[PDB]
Design a protein around this ligand. Structure first.
Ligand SMILES: [Mg+2]
Ligand SMILES: [Mg+2]
Ligand SMILES: [Mg+2]
Ligand SMILES: [Mg+2]
Ligand SMILES: [Mg+2]
Ligand SMILES: [Mg+2]
Ligand SMILES: [Mg+2]
Ligand SMILES: [Mg+2]
Ligand SMILES: [Mg+2]
Ligand SMILES: [Mg+2]
Ligand SMILES: [Mg+2]
Ligand SMILES: [Mg+2]
Ligand SMILES: [Mg+2]
Ligand SMILES: [Mg+2]
Ligand SMILES: [Mg+2]
Ligand SMILES: [Mg+2]
Ligand SMILES: [Mg+2]
Ligand SMILES: [Mg+2]
Ligand SMILES: [Mg+2]
Ligand SMILES: [Mg+2]
Ligand SMILES: [Mg+2]
Ligand SMILES: [Mg+2]
Ligand SMILES: [Mg+2]
Ligand SMILES: [Mg+2]
Ligand SMILES: [Mg+2]
Lengths: 168, 185, 257
RNA sequence: CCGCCCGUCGCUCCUACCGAUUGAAAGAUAUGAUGAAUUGUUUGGACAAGAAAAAUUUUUUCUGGAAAAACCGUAAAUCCUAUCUUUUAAAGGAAGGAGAAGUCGUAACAAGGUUUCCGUAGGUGAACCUGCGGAAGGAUCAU
RNA sequence: AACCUGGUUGAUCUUGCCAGUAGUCAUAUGCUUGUCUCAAAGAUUAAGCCAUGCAAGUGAAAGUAUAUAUAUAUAUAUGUAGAAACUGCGAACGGCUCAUUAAAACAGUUAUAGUCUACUUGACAUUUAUAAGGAUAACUACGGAAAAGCUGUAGCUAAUACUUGCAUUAUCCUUGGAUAAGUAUUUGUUAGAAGGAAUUAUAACAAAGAAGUAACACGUAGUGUGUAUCAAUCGAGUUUCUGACCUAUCAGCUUUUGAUGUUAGGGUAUUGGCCUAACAUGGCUAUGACGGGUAACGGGGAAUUAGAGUUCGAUUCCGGAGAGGGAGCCUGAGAAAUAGCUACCACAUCUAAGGAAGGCAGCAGGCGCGUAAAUUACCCAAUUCUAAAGAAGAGAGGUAGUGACAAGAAAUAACAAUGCAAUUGUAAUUGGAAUGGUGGGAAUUUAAAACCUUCCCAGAGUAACAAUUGGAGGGCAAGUCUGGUGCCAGCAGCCGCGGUAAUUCCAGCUCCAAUAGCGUAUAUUAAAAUUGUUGCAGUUAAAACGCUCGUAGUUGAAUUUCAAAGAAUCAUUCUUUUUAAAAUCCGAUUUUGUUACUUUGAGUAAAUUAGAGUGUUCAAAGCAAACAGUUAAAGCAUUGUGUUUGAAUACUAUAGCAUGGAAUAACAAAAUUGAACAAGCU
RNA sequence: AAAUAGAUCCGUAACUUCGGGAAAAGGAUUGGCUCUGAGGACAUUAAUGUUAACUCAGAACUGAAACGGACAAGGGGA
């Protein structure tokens, strides 16, 4: 099937190689996982030493952090809005490592009713105008096609300005 | 797989097939020592050439060098044990002076002739080949056997030989039989 | 297929086993265990070629079936078990004790220690690990894990180990004046002390050793084994005491009939 | 010197060359057109078992699941076209080497009877002759 | 052993080739062959095609037994054995061949701080219980098909097969409190004994979370089987630097469709244009890129050589690749496996015509091809491997059979008396010793034969128990002998011989050479200083461009610390003291540019090679062996107990790691301008 | 009489007066619908606003496999 060897490439001078060896099965290249937004559905694939990795096929929730405070919460994913590789991937709503998504933000505001020692932080405004509608922008940080999960953090500061400007 | 036991050659051809003086010298030596072919002359020449090559290489080397000391002592001891140098000429320069008759003098055939014990050198060869000779309580029947120094006082007839105190051969006993049935008939 | 090989050919066996190039295409092919293949001998070699107790392979098997052979105080029945450097061997039926050592050549010998000396061995450290809960484990050349190591034990020095209980008795440091046995190329059984240590930054480290006849040699740091403090060794030694003479002097000595 | 020797022409044999025939055959590479088998996702749902009044029935739900389809891939094979490599046929044309007392002349070797050669151009059955410039390896180391 | 002869002429001295000479672990072939030891053998052409048989299995305490036998104690109990079958492990090792392959593979040197790893070894664990579940082989009964290692329906029954699940404490502040309530792995915020270097071991805080910690067997506190994570071991995948044959009548190549980089992802056991999207215009080359050829697998090595060199390496060991040609895939720790599966191309087997089944470059064996190559034998006794691991199996492997490939030793007489030539020879005649080859029988050897040694019996005179293959003009050792032929037949590597008196053709005799061996053909090395670095030649023998300029390449003047004074030595060798300067000890120690180059070390597979020791009866070999003793002294441990050994050393690029250095050579620093220091300064 | 024809993207021999031959020969694509990307000007401060006009690339869906749908429009080679 798909192989990861370099015997079919050209040399750095531009000359072509002669092949005298078949494919060896320790350069497998099996096809990609196109994880999409929906109800949970995860498969199993076995690696070399019978080491399992998990293929997500549909996810709609995960664990999301608030980096300023160091707190994590499980919450629901609403949509995908940006992707730096190509925007054909936000069109089909696929989840990959470095997406920008929108998540339900009620669990985070509710938790702020314990007001660990970051009690003089002065939350920045743009995050507050996001909180008003009940949705915020986050960045995925895991690899769903390898661990079967979708995790990420809330975007703040200059990164938030960058991604606001990119979406206009 | 192929076997791991190896082998080697023992002679070499003259490279000039019809040279008169070399041919005459070879006949000299063959007649004097009672040999069969030129191949025996050539095997002895091969051996002597190896010895001389080792001696030359050692001599070109530096004095009080470890390699020279070790290998020269070994070679000189081997030569004196073989009976080719002696007692007052062990100096690695007398190795280059060894000639063909010296080596050819140590054969069991020549030794059996020179110690009485045989009326000629052809007699000496035929006796060795017919199981009549011992070298120190071991019976040897090969005429190219080279006698070492401490083995040359132990050459003698064999205990199983009619010339060395045993029963007579197939001819004596048949003659004695015929005589017996002659005298008892 | 192309998986792990299982056969060993005779001319490709390590040369210090001293195997006959006739009589066979194969060699015993030691098993996996506490020692590397090239720094060890299989038990059949010890028990047939060296001690001459057995005539064939099947006789070694019949010896080992009856549980009378122990290495490091444990009975072993595997005909290709690896034995290795500082291990002790006990045979109940004969009441014998041995320790393997290198001679002044590069080959292993059984040294025939006494019963009292059969209760310990010397292990050299290869690395020290820190694991969960902050406990320290030392790994020895013997392929052995020692938990709760003393904080003053470092990577290259040696330790003395009880055999009935796997505990430590004392430890010997790796310094400029310590006594050493060398275990690899061009000098495999020499005993000297130490003269200096080099510590080249990105590459190997070279150390120098002086004999008791004031002869000096050098080697890599990885093939140096500490066997004593400045004065005396902590184990008995074979008859030459690790003193290697050159070929001229050796030939002169051998010529005493 | 009754020496030696040069070329065309006629005969026989052998080797290679050009050659109309859009000549022939066997391979290799690249583009294109079809395209067996099959990894992965989705669709599908013969029937297997659970949760429900019962008389050994219908309907609901969960779960597992064969045949068969679709799509993105990994892609044997076949065909058409275009090149490249090697081998090979042929009317006719034109060389070289070898052989045999052949025919015609006499260019070279002597100042060889017009000293011999080089480059270039033209002409003649043949060897060759003639023009322009050069050399001595000349038949003169000199008036 | 660092070597030369014949041939151009009427004769001479040269250049120059042709021929002669010797070797080949180098193939074929012709003639001939008595003994023993050793042992290559369908590579070359066709990685061409295959009938038949075999080539991988496995239970001696320890998973499952009313198939069924059997013993003892007395209907019961404890045991021994066990067709079938389920389950477990192996079958990815071994064996074969050389088609592909020219910066590829391979070799020496590196990295994994970018990874996976069964068996074996050591450490050692976390959020109904007097014992849980259902279902299936073997088996019984009813069947189908020409055929196949084909299988349908119904009824039973086990397990270390497939599943569910019980009970238990530890740490911080002489009771309690908090509980810890989670091994690997993933995400976010932090702190931080070792390595040259950490985003490293490790610790805290907030979210997820696999898989496990004995519902098992033996009867030895002991084992077997299984199990989370770490470490070791037997290995692999990638990866740094340097190293190949012929060709320029191959000079520009790569990039649309990945060529060279950047950013973000996907995928893999991990890194990587390995793949996808966006972006930039790069990357290699006369120091030979890109192509063509190879009757090219690489290496350890082989042949021949004074020293340089030239040629070979299919083939004992290591690495690579393949199983008629290609491409896919399952199981598994490990495979892109082929005596595993799926499809196409080619070839081919059985058939009742519907269908089924194939892969000798494994061991024997057959056809074809050709100049070119052996038995359809015996055994697991040795060397090792696999298993439920003494006990089974193995065409791996060993043993014989065939065998003038190659290698070593070695018969075909010897001795007397007489006679005859010069003490001698034997040319000649007589007679008695010696001895294998050969036939028979044994002791041994061997799994069992067989061979070798050893012993007994019979056994040589034309010792018919009968040696050959090439030659006799020269090179080149050996007839001017006798018949036949007559420029014919023929010989002759080269010069030549043969036309009626042939030293050369055909024969007889006689001589020479090597000899159980000797000729012939093709290739290759020396000879060849006729490929020349060492080491050729260029006026007239083959050969200086018509002439000058010019880039790459090759090669380049002299100069910077030179000396002095002792000792130990048969003029000499080896060394001991230091005469400028600056920076580390209140005038004492040591430091003072880089390379090339040379010295010394480290590290390295054996076989082959060089070389030390050792009477295989010698030798080629091998890696062994030696010493006292009609059965003991003696020694060292208290009646015990044999002793001393050997299997060395060197070599292993030209590149890489470390190291002393004064000569030679290169490079650095070196002014239409540059430093150092003292004292007020921010 | 028939067959070919428009545009776009590839690929093009002999021979040659070196300008050609050449549209040589040959091959692939083309509708509709929903989207993505790239090409300007002006005025207040690397930010902010106000505004055009036609072209050219790429992707997903869709249909009795059709799309220069009628019109228009070279046959080629030795
Ligand atoms: Mg394979
Ligand atoms: Mg054995
Ligand atoms: Mg004239
Ligand atoms: Mg002449
Ligand atoms: Mg193999
Ligand atoms: Mg792209
Ligand atoms: Mg090879
Ligand atoms: Mg071949
Ligand atoms: Mg073979
Ligand atoms: Mg191999
Ligand atoms: Mg075949
Ligand atoms: Mg295959
Ligand atoms: Mg087969
Ligand atoms: Mg097949
Ligand atoms: Mg065969
Ligand atoms: Mg043959
Ligand atoms: Mg057992
Ligand atoms: Mg048996
Ligand atoms: Mg004659
Ligand atoms: Mg030559
Ligand atoms: Mg030469
Ligand atoms: Mg020479
Ligand atoms: Mg010359
Ligand atoms: Mg000139
Ligand atoms: Mg035209």
């Amino acid at each position: 099937g798909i192989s990861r060897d370099g015997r079919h490439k050209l040399r750095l001078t531009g000359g072509k190689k002669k092949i005298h060896k078949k494919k060896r099965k320790y350069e497998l290249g099996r096809p990609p996982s196109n994880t999409k937004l929906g109800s949970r559905q995860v498969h199993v694939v076995r690696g070399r030493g019978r080491n399992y990795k998990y293929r997500a096929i549909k996810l709609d929730s995960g664990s999301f952090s608030w980096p300023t405070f160091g707190i994590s919460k499980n919450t629901r994913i609403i949509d995908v809005v940006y992707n730096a590789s190509n925007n054909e991937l936000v069109r089909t709503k696929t989840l990959v490592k470095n997406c920008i998504v929108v998540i339900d933000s009620h669990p985070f505001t509710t938790w702020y009713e314990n007001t660990k020692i970051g009690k003089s932080k002065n939350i920045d405004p743009l995050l507050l105008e996001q909180f008003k509608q009940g949705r915020v922008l986050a960045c995925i940080s895991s690899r769903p096609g390898q661990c079967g999960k979708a995790d990420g953090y809330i975007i703040e500061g200059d990164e938030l300005l960058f991604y606001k400007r990119k979406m206009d | 797989p192929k076997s791991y036991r190896n082998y080697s050659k023992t002679a070499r051809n003259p490279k000039r097939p019809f040279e008169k003086e070399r041919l005459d010298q070879e006949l000299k030596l063959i007649g004097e020592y009672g040999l069969k072919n030129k191949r025996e002359i050539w095997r002895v020449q091969y051996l002597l050439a190896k010895i001389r090559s080792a001696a030359r290489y050692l001599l070109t080397l530096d004095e009080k060098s470890s390699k020279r000391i070790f290998q020269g002592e070994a070679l000189l001891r081997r030569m004196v044990r073989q009976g080719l140098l002696g007692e007052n000429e062990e100096k690695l320069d007398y190795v280059l002076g060894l000639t063909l008759p010296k080596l050819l003098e140590r054969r069991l055939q020549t030794k059996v002739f020179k110690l009485g014990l045989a009326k000629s050198v052809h007699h000496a060869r035929v006796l060795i080949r017919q199981r009549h000779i011992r070298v120190g309580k071991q019976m040897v029947d090969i005429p190219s056997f080279l006698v070492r120094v401490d083995s040359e006082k132990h050459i003698d007839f064999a205990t199983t030989s009619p010339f060395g105190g045993a029963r007579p051969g197939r001819v004596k006993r048949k003659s004695l039989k015929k005589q017996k049935e002659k005298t008892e008939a | 297929g192309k998986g792990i090989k299982k056969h060993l050919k005779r001319v490709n066996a390590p040369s210090h086993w001293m195997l006959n190039k006739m009589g066979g295409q194969y060699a015993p092919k030691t098993s996996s265990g506490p020692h590397k293949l090239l720094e060890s001998i299989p038990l059949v070699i010890l028990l047939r070629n060296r001690l001459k107790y057995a005539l064939t392979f099947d006789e070694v098997k019949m010896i080992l079936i009856q549980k009378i052979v122990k290495v490091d105080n444990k009975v072993r029945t595997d005909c290709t078990f690896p034995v290795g450097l500082m291990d002790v061997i006990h045979i109940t039926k004969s009441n014998e004790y041995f320790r393997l050592l290198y001679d002044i050549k590069g080959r292993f010998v059984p040294h025939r220690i006494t019963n009292e000396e059969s209760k310990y061995k010397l292990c050299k450290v290869k690395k020290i690990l820190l694991r969960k809960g902050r406990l320290s484990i030392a790994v020895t050349h013997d392929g052995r894990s020692i938990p709760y190591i003393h904080p003053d034990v470092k990577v290259n020095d040696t330790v003395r180990l009880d055999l009935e209980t796997g505990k430590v008795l004392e430890h010997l440091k790796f310094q400029v004046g310590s006594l050493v046995m060398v275990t690899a190329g061009h000098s495999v059984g020499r005993v000297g002390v130490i003269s200096s240590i080099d510590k080249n930054m990105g590459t190997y480290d070279i150390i120098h050793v002086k004999d008791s006849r004031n002869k000096v040699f050098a080697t890599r740091l990885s093939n140096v084994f500490v066997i004593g403090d400045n004065t005396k060794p902590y184990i008995s030694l074979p008859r030459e005491k690790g003193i290697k003479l050159d070929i001229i002097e050796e030939r002169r000595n051998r010529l005493k009939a």
